[PDB]
Amino acid sequence: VQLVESGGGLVQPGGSLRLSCAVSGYSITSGYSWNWIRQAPGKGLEWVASITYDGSTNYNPSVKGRITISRDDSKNTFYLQMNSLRAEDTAVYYCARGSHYFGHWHFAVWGQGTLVTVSSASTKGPSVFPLAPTAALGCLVKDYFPEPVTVSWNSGALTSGVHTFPAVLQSSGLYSLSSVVTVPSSSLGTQTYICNVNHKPSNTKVDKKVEP
Amino acid sequence: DIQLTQSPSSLSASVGDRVTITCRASQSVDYDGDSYMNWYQQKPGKAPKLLIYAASYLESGVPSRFSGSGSGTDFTLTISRLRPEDFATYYCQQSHEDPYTFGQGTKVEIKRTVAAPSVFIFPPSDEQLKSGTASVVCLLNNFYPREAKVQWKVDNAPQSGNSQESVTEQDSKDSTYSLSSTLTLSKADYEKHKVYACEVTHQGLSSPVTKSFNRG
């Protein structure tokens, strides 16, 4: 079973978030609880809402009043809406499925989370530049907003020796990151190295060949 | 709400070590003979993974080096022999009373021997310079411990205020870190100078290591 969240990205302060979690279609949802749990950047985990098979909801009083959880079993999907968004609401939002222990719940299955960024700024896609060449080579992914960017190498075939650095917030208010890989220097004239960069908020997908 | 306090907030332990972390709840999480405390592992960038439910039961498939114990207010998670991939933040979580609540996490870092970095310097690409800015990058690869100093020099003059650094989370196989330092200048300013150098200090290096290039 897989849980896949959608609806993340930028939201204006005072606006509404609308997230969804799609669950593998083969799975039956009735013997479980369905939850949203969030994690602000650098902080711990906060449970915010749950729903059970009969539509019964439960909310954390920390946000109760501006949150609603709902379900559409015809699409095996659950939803979260929050209104009146503020800075405390910037976080990765995870959907999680609870299983029973003697009438109580534990979160045995989690989605991979979606980042919601509460901001009045515009989305901006990155530029991608080579860090040309044990040898080291890489790609610099500059000036994007909001997070996140993902990088892979050679479509995921090159993983050993890859280091993708955490993004840094520049004085411009835009992020930058680099991804580097160390490879055998002899392999350089013979093997192609392509960094695959994805910034889904700006629909940016770049495959940049890094040559010597 | 029930508050969960974990101890210690962070620890460093070597590969093979027995690691114990504690969670104290502000009231008992027992009901009718069982204790409603769960534990999760969260590796950087990933969602949490359930390890232990109801204080002491291992979720099926979790490695047997993980175990939990406790009752009432007091709970422990033990890793009997730590592996490098066990670097993570570990959270306890109570399911006894709504709202369900988590501890603040304990970060487990792997201790290992000191390793000096290897250092690489990258000039700005011509594609970036065409766009008006120059990013010069200095890479420190696979070193331990995390603490390191990088000083930029431009035609020998020490720089400050025009660089930013980023460090990886600890590596899950070799327990090292890598660090990038980026110096950012306009194209015009970059083209006024010849020698760009980064000077690195680290415990594993008896004297600082400089890497440099001549523009062009």
Numbering used by the authors:
A (entry chain H): 2 to 134, 143 to 221
B (entry chain L): 1 to 216
Wording from the paper:
Immunoglobulin E (IgE) plays a central role in the allergic response, in which cross-linking of allergen by Fc∊RI-bound IgE triggers mast cell and basophil degranulation and the release of inflammatory mediators. Omalizumab is a clinically approved anti-IgE monoclonal antibody that binds to free IgE, also with high affinity, preventing its interaction with Fc∊RI. Mutations were therefore designed to disrupt two recurring packing interactions observed in the omalizumab Fab crystal structures without interfering with the ability of the omalizumab Fab to recognize IgE-Fc; this led to the successful crystallization and subsequent structure determination of the Fab/IgE-Fc complex.
We created two omalizumab-derived Fabs, namely FabXol2, with Ser81Arg and Gln83Arg mutations, and FabXol3, which additionally contains a Leu158Pro mutation. One omalizumab-derived Fab, termed FabXol3, which contains three point mutations in the light chain, subsequently enabled us to solve the 3.7 Å resolution crystal structure of the complex with IgE-Fc, revealing that omalizumab inhibits binding to Fc∊RI allosterically. To understand the effects of the Ser81Arg and Gln83Arg (VL) mutations on Fab crystal packing interactions, we solved the structures of FabXol2 and FabXol3 alone. Both FabXol2 and FabXol3 crystallized in the same crystal form, with one Fab molecule in the asymmetric unit. With the exception of the light-chain residue 158, which is leucine in FabXol2 and proline in FabXol3, the structures are otherwise essentially identical. As the overall structures of FabXol2 and FabXol3 are similar, further discussion will be limited to the FabXol3 structure, which was solved at higher resolution (1.45 Å for FabXol3 compared with 2.05 Å for FabXol2). Comparison of the FabXol3 structure with the structure of the complex with IgE-Fc reveals that the positions adopted by Ser25–Ser31, and Tyr33 in FabXol3 would not preclude an interaction with the C∊3 domain; however, Gly32 would clash with Ser378. This particular CDRH1 conformation thus appears to be incompatible with IgE binding. Engineering the Ser81Arg and Gln83Arg mutations in the VL domain of the omalizumab Fab clearly disrupted the interactions seen in the FabXol structure, but these residues also formed new packing interactions in the FabXol2 and FabXol3 structures that were seen when these molecules were crystallized alone.
